[PDB]
Amino acid sequence: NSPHELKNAAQRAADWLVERQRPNGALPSRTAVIESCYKGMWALHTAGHTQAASAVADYVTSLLQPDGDIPQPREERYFLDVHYLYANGYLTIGAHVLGRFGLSRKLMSFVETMRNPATGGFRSHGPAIPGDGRCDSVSTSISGLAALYTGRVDTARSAADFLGSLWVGQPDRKNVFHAVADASGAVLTSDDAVAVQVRKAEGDWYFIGLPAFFLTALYEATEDRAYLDLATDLMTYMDEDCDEDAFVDSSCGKAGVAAALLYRLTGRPRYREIAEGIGTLLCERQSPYGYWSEEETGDVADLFWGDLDMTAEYVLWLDLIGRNLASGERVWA
């Protein structure tokens, strides 16, 4: 598919969401949880549905606590002790791009209270959830990206330092990507820490793909080739050392965005190929009705939270892939 076609798919999905948005601004999830709609502000704004995006901001604002967190409603364990701040990161970006500067300042200030100042990582478990202070690549990358959008570039550079340390410290990168470090900054290989089985088709690739996207954006912001080189290390790892599932699994969109940005910035044709392939696959999986769903077909009035999240996520990724491929073609051809 062409960049225009990727965007057409994103717009059909955004229209589907907006048609079913609730009066208070919540998106049509079968459970009322923040993990169903945290990407909604940014995705809907990207699609030009700024009134719907602002309505999500109104809903988010009504859940905001005095410390700047949204601790509830949350049910999915990945949003409790694996990467709690994954929700907060997209909320911060979406609020900021909408110009909701009070919301973005309060959300980002809370995010920063969970940063480990010695390692640059962001803690995996939220304030109400007990934990050992471990920090993971997804919490850290999304918090770094939110830092870029809010202008906290020092925080973003520190997040990149953590990701570099995590990458250098891998004990067996050919077989496993250990996505977590302890509070001292050493890679956590324990049974209970997220680990991508890179030679199996078992998903979780965004623990590598989201760092690759963030580091590429940080390179764009700073021109520091250390970040480009880490991003390309991660992309080459996914392309050459990881299972084919890395560019096929539902979580491959992050890598697709990173590849499209890398193509615009470097012109290397393999990055265009990776991005085009991922964009086309996501486009092919879209329901004729406009949403994306693991298991459901037909004309549903709402979705389970994970499918609703995936639908907003693919609005964002197809848009970002499409615009970076379009501009890359202009710049390099």
Ligand X SMILES: *[C@@H](O)[C@H](NC(C)=O)[C@@H](O)[C@H]1O[C@H](O[C@H]2[C@H](O)[C@@H](O)[C@H](N)C[C@@H]2N)[C@H](N)C[C@@H]1O
Interacting residue ranges for ligand X, rule: CB under 6 A: 78, 203-204, 206, 249-251, 306, 309-310, 313
Q: Report the C-alpha gap between 18 and 31 in whole angstroms.
A: 17
Backbone phi, psi, residue 127, to 5°: -60, -35
Taking the complex as a whole, the smallest distance from the CB of residue 265 to a second copy amounts, in Å, to 9
**Residue closer to ligand X (CB basis): 60 or 208:** 208
Distant-in-sequence, close-in-space partners of 190: CB < 8 Å, separation ≥ 6: none
Sign of CA dihedral 86, 89, 90, 95: positive
Strand pairing category for 176-178 and 135-136:
unpaired
List 22, 31, 51, 174, residue binding a second copy (CB under 8 A): 51
> Pick from ligand X, a second copy, none: which does 105 bind, CB < 5 to 8 A by kind?
a second copy
Interacting residues of 270 by C-beta distance below 8 A, sequence separation 6+: 239
In the complex with ligand X, the residue whose CB is nearer, 166 or 315, is 315
Q: Which of 5, 75, 161, 220 binds a second copy (CB under 8 A)?
A: 220
Selection from a second copy, ligand X, none that 306 binds (CB < 5 to 8 A by kind) is ligand X
Residue 128 CB burial class (10 angstroms; 0-12, 13-18, ≥19) = exposed
| Three-state secondary structure call for residue 62 | helix
Segment 160 to 219, residues that bind a second copy, using CB under 8 A: 217
25 binds, among a second copy, ligand X, none (CB under 5 to 8 A by kind): a second copy
Nearer to a second copy, 5 or 75 (CB): 5
* Residue 11 Cβ vs a second copy, minimum distance, rounded to whole Å: 7
